[PDB]
Swiss-Prot record, chain A:
Assembly information from the UniProt record: Interacts with HTR6. Interacts with SPRED2.
PTM description: Ubiquitinated by RNF7/RBX2, leading to its degradation.
Tissue occurrence: Detected in brain, peripheral nerve, lung, colon and muscle.
Domain of life: Eukaryota
Residues included from the entire protein: 2113 to 2203 of 2839
Protein name: Neurofibromin
Disease linked to the protein: Neurofibromatosis 1: A disease characterized by patches of skin pigmentation (cafe-au-lait spots), Lisch nodules of the iris, tumors in the peripheral nervous system and fibromatous skin tumors. Individuals with the disorder have increased susceptibility to the development of benign and malignant tumors.
Function of the protein: Stimulates the GTPase activity of Ras. NF1 shows greater affinity for Ras GAP, but lower specific activity. May be a regulator of Ras activity.
Domain notes: Binds phospholipids via its C-terminal CRAL-TRIO domain. Binds primarily glycerophospholipids with monounsaturated C18:1 and/or C16:1 fatty acid moieties and a phosphatidylethanolamine or phosphatidylcholine headgroup. Has lesser affinity for lipids containing phosphatidylserine and phosphatidylinositol.
Native source organism of the sequence: Homo sapiens (Human)
From Swiss-Prot, chain B:
Tissue specificity statement from the Swiss-Prot or TrEMBL entry: Detected in brain, peripheral nerve, lung, colon and muscle.
Effect recorded for residue 241 to E: In NF1 and NFNS; significant reduction of intrinsic GAP activity
Function: Stimulates the GTPase activity of Ras. NF1 shows greater affinity for Ras GAP, but lower specific activity. May be a regulator of Ras activity.
Shown segment, full-protein numbering: 1183 to 1476 of 2839
Domain of life of the source: Eukaryota
Record protein name field: Neurofibromin
Modification note: Ubiquitinated by RNF7/RBX2, leading to its degradation.
Arginine finger (site feature) positions: 94
Subunit structure: Interacts with HTR6. Interacts with SPRED2.
Length: 81, 273
């Protein structure tokens, strides 16, 4: 929902959430759990999840998350599933 | 530089690979642990090393056996020596010895995050609330100024003690697994040593070398970025003394002003246990 910047920011939010979820000593997770989270981070990095998140044609979400410093597509509920 | 740095093991020199293999063989040389007996290299280095390097030895040992996942057995051997080298239950591990240096380094490297997360809210209560309250903390009648009241300071100190202690008892659930393994390794060999208050010596050492040093010196721990006012410092020293007396399962004797606090100390014996 919203322009390109907010959608890219949402994607970066999801990536940072998983990244901080695996790289912190507070939770003291198991090893296999860290393996499946590491797999999940890779699968969210895929272009398929870019198209799920509404960001298309953009190579790097992190670049256009800050692009001002330096709605046409419809939304389908199966992607939300 | 990244793609160069993760290139692999085909581009390194013969000298580099020979050096790596020789280093690895030396690391394996230490970590060979024979059946039914303690590890030989550690037994040699425990009894050979001069005192000036002792702590440094402890450090590299803690860096080694943990990375080989064998830290439990190293601690087992060290404590297995220390339990017979020390006789009195009070004198166990309190003196300067290699067991003390190793467990001190273990506390410092492992429980820093847990200690900081436990300690900063009880600090922040003192930083703002009791600071504008400016509750005094002098309990020695000779050190008491005439303007201050003895009983009010004692009540403030008491309430502060139950707040800190109940915070720790609440955070009983939260420990890193490695620190718990260290405590278990200590407890098993201590129970082998004596059948009386095997848990008690564990608790006394636990408050002695981990908990109370942060309480006396919060600024030195790095948890508090500023030096606190000296009244708070004196009060925190009193916290450390009273909690140590709780851990020792014995009440104050010399301090008459601590005698009313002995009832609260002996009241919390079973919960601490």
């Amino acid at each position: 929902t919203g322009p390109l910047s907010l959608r890219a920011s949402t994607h970066g939010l999801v990536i940072n959430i998983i990244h901080s979820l695996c790289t912190c000593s507070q939770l003291h997770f198991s090893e296999e759990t860290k393996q499946v989270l590491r797999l999940s981070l890779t699968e969210f990095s895929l272009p398929k999840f870019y198209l799920l998140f509404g960001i298309s044609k953009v190579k790097s979400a992190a670049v256009i998350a800050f692009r001002s410093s330096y709605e046409r597509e419809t939304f389908a509920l199966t992607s939300l599933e | 530089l990244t793609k160069i740095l993760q290139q692999g093991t085909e581009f390194d020199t013969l000298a580099e690979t020979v050096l790596a293999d020789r280093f690895e063989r030396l690391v394996e040389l230490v970590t060979m642990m024979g059946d039914q007996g303690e590890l030989p290299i550690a037994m040699a280095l425990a009894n050979v090393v001069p005192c000036s390097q002792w702590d440094e030895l402890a450090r590299v040992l803690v860096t080694l056996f943990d990375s080989r996942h064998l830290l439990y057995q190293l601690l087992w051997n060290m404590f297995s020596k220390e339990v017979e080298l020390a006789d009195s239950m009070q004198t166990l591990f309190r003196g300067n010895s290699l067991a003390s240096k190793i467990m001190t380094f273990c506390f410092k490297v492992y429980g820093a995050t847990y200690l900081q997360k436990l300690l900063d809210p009880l600090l922040r209560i003192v930083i703002t609330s009791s600071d504008w309250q400016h509750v005094s903390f002098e309990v020695d009648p000779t050190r008491l100024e005439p303007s201050e009241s003895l009983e009010e300071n004692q009540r403030n100190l008491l309430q502060m003690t139950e707040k800190f202690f109940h915070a720790i008892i609440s955070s009983s659930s939260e420990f890193p697994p490695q620190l718990r393994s260290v405590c278990h390794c200590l407890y098993q060999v201590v129970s082998q040593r004596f059948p009386q208050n095997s848990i008690g010596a564990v608790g006394s050492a636990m408050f002695l070398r981990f908990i109370n040093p942060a309480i006396v010196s919060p600024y030195e721990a790095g948890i508090l970025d500023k030096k606190p006012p000296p009244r708070i410092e004196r009060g925190l020293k009193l916290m450390s003394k009273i909690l140590q007396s709780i851990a020792n399962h014995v009440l104050f004797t010399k301090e008459e002003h601590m005698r009313p606090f002995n009832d609260f100390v002996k009241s919390n014996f079973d919960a601490a246990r």
